[PDB]
Design a protein around this ligand. Structure first.
Ligand code: NA
Lengths: 258, 271
């Protein structure tokens, strides 16, 4: 028997196409889920400060943000974890000395160096950013994005040690997405479930990236798309259609959730 | 033997015009050398705390008037208002056309009337300020940026209005709020979260550090420090402090640049 109480949705490439935004069918699906007593919670690597306006306009029940460091539900901030400030200063000091592209994030802003800005500029050309790393001083930081060799990464691991884990890793581009140990999307989903009195069996998620693989152990059903990260597709319960082929709506309709 | 020195910023540790005296900096180093932790306890957010305070190398920071607690870099507490309630309040105050500001831990969001209140407070820097010194910041330029508020986590609402407009804010927030401070003559209300005032914050840290009220000494100045005094054994004010704080204070120490903090600590054999 299945009666879902929690829909977990990733934003980028799941709920929302990076170029064409959110399809009406997904907005409708969300509205229908909520009518059927199934909470809809955004579960994103984005911070509340970088979540897009169209996502904020949906009236979802909660937000798991920063890749799992921040949990808000029905407006109430439940969890908001940030790295030890002294450890961030050491990392920032190291990474400036190493002259590698990097960024750090608070729940409001992304602080990035020149090399990192140049990476995001080029990412956008393959569809403004500022060298503002010197604006970091006392903000609460929950994520470090690093483009470097294995040696520079090991130096960051020597500073953070057991306090960190990788949310995501792209070997080819030398990219590491560093978050706090046990504050990935999966752990946040569990914390939220525990606050709401919802079980794993009552939870269904939709993801697309490597940062969504962790959603699986927190969910009964995990849905990916054809274009999703292969490791996610390999463990997904099913593959729904692409964003603008009404994948979320159709998947929810097939499972009789809406 | 005291284990926790709680220091206020504005009007106690730091003079609004002249900054922090060397005796205070030296007294902090001396307390730490004697295994007494030094923790800043301010209405300021980590984002509005002045660089000279950040350069001191204090053991921790109780910020936002008590919603935020950090110790040895470790963020221990960081409470923010319900986002939906803040939307209602922001919506209500825009239509009532009163000066107001809301604060996140990084930033202050203020309407036009509030920008003008703050510009004037900076122009009046050096005069007997009381509350103005708690808001003055040379770091930023003030501006009508309330429309930039959307999803930021908010812990404080500053309101300049009649009690009708305040009663309307109280109807929305109910027992989720309390007044950290209030200046009746200027119609000022400093609205914080219920049970996240300076004393409750001091008590959370005491609990975590395993330090007692008896092992805690505080230095305060404003109406917002009355509660600070209630979570401490020895409470120190100054001659120009808020009278209600002076009424409950253990002692009155000398003015900032008369080395009050150092002299009081030396007199008590803490340093
Ligand atoms: Na994604």
């Amino acid at each position: 028997m299945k009666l879902y109480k929690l829909l977990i949705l990733d934003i980028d490439g799941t709920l929302r196409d990076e170029v064409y935004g959110i399809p009406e069918s997904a907005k409708h699906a969300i509205r229908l889920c909520q009518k059927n007593h199934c909470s809809v919670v955004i579960c994103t690597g984005r911070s509340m400060g970088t979540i897009q306006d169209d996502v904020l306009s949906l009236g979802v029940d909660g937000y798991i943000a920063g890749g799992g460091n921040y949990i808000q539900y029905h407006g109430e901030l439940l969890y908001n974890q940030s790295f030890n400030q002294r450890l961030i200063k050491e990392v920032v000091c190291l990474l400036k000395k190493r002259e590698v592209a990097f960024s750090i994030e608070s729940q409001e802003k992304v602080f990035m160096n020149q090399k990192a800005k140049e990476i995001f500029e080029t990412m956008n050309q393959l569809k403004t950013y500022e060298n503002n790393i010197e604006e970091y001083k006392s903000q609460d930081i929950h994520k470090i994005c690093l483009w470097s060799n294995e040696k520079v990464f090991d130096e960051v691991k020597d500073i953070l040690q057991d306090k960190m884990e990788l949310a995501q890793r792209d070997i080819s581009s030398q990219y590491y997405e560093i978050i706090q140990k046990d504050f990935h999307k999966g752990k946040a989903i569990k914390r939220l479930q525990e606050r709401l009195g919802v079980t794993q069996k009552e939870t269904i998620c939709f993801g697309d990236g490597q940062n969504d693989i962790v959603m699986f152990q927190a969910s009964d059903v995990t849905i990916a798309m054809k274009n999703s990260h292969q490791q996610l597709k390999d463990i997904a319960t099913s593959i729904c259609e692409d964003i603008f082929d009404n994948g979320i709506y159709k998947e929810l309709k097939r499972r009789n959730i809406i």
